[PDB]
Design a protein around this ligand. Structure first.
Ligand SMILES: Nc1c2c(nc3ccccc13)CCCC2
Length: 288
């Protein structure tokens, strides 16, 4: 069993199938529309330049949406948005998106090709420490080695009335169950790392930071995962298991318990003849 994250090709295909059969993206859309406003309501107060640091170039369309809400609250104010992404493929895509978008004259972009870690290391070399008004980490901690250290660092980069926003899958979610129980039995990679909003609050508690957590429901239609032979079904399987060609490369003893175990409540809910996997999300905001 080889980690799915080691086959850039498969991954994407799957990831893509994941978005196509989930309310993930719309879920964040709702957060940004009905909650974000009041959250970032004062990060611009008294500043003639609003700085926004985004760690991860995977949700370009979401980043842009954040800008939309920040511009609305602070008309005229120029915005400096830096992006810290390791994947050239991503940055590349991001950029394309920028060029095709309007109402971004009062925004300055700057992409840095590296990891949160590398970025962080560098900064320390600099003598001066630079602050920020808004930091955010959408679905990417999974790929961070030192969470506690990472959290504390960027918190210190927050300026006055600044805020840091983090998104991960919720403790009360299918993923949680899927990992607490089966994890050990899946390919242990050094790149990925199973983490839930739960692991998060404990770390933040022990760190002593003041945060606020919000959960919203999101689903993943895994119906094609019971139709033996279905191509689509196969990809999805690859995703949950974060493994390559899961079926044809895993112990049926296991693939047997899952097939059963997934169609159960604590993992999924049965709807319009559909089997919906609990993809609930958590949004954490941290004060400076
Ligand atoms: N829903 C997601 C999960 C992971 N990464 C993701 C990356 C961005 C979009 C959603 C994601 C890793 C493990 C589990 C779930």
């Amino acid at each position: 069993m080889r980690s799915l994250f080691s086959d850039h090709g498969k991954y994407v295909e799957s990831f893509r199938r994941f978005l196509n059969h989930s309310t993930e993206h719309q879920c964040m859309q709702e957060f940004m529309d009905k909650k974000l406003p009041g959250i970032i309501g004062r990060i611009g107060d008294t500043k003639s330049e609003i700085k926004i640091l985004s760690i991860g170039g995977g949700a370009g369309e979401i980043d842009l949406q954040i800008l939309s809400k920040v511009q609305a609250q602070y008309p005229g104010v120029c915005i400096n948005n830096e992006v810290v992404e390791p994947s050239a493929e991503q940055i590349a895509k991001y950029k394309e998106l920028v060029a095709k978008t309007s109402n971004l004259e009062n925004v300055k972009f700057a992409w840095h090709k590296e990891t949160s870690s590398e970025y962080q290391s560098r900064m320390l070399e600099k003598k001066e420490l630079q602050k920020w008004d808004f930091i955010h980490m959408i679905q990417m901690l999974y790929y961070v080695k030192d969470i506690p250290a990472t959290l504390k660092f960027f918190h210190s980069l927050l300026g006055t009335n600044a805020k840091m926003l983090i998104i991960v899958v919720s403790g009360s979610s299918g993923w949680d169950k899927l990992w607490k129980k089966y994890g050990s039995r899946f390919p242990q990679d050094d790149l990925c790392q199973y983490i839930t909003s739960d692991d998060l609050t404990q770390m933040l508690d022990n760190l002593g930071l003041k945060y606020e957590c919000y959960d919203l429901l999101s689903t993943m239609d895994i119906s094609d995962c019971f139709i033996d032979g279905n191509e689509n079904g196969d990809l999805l399987w690859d995703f949950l298991t974060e493994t390559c060609n899961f079926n044809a490369t895993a112990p049926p003893d296991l693939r047997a318990e899952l097939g059963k175990d997934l169609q159960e409540p604590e993992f999924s809910a049965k709807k319009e003849g559909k089997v919906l996997f609990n993809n609930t999300l958590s949004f954490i905001v941290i004060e400076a």
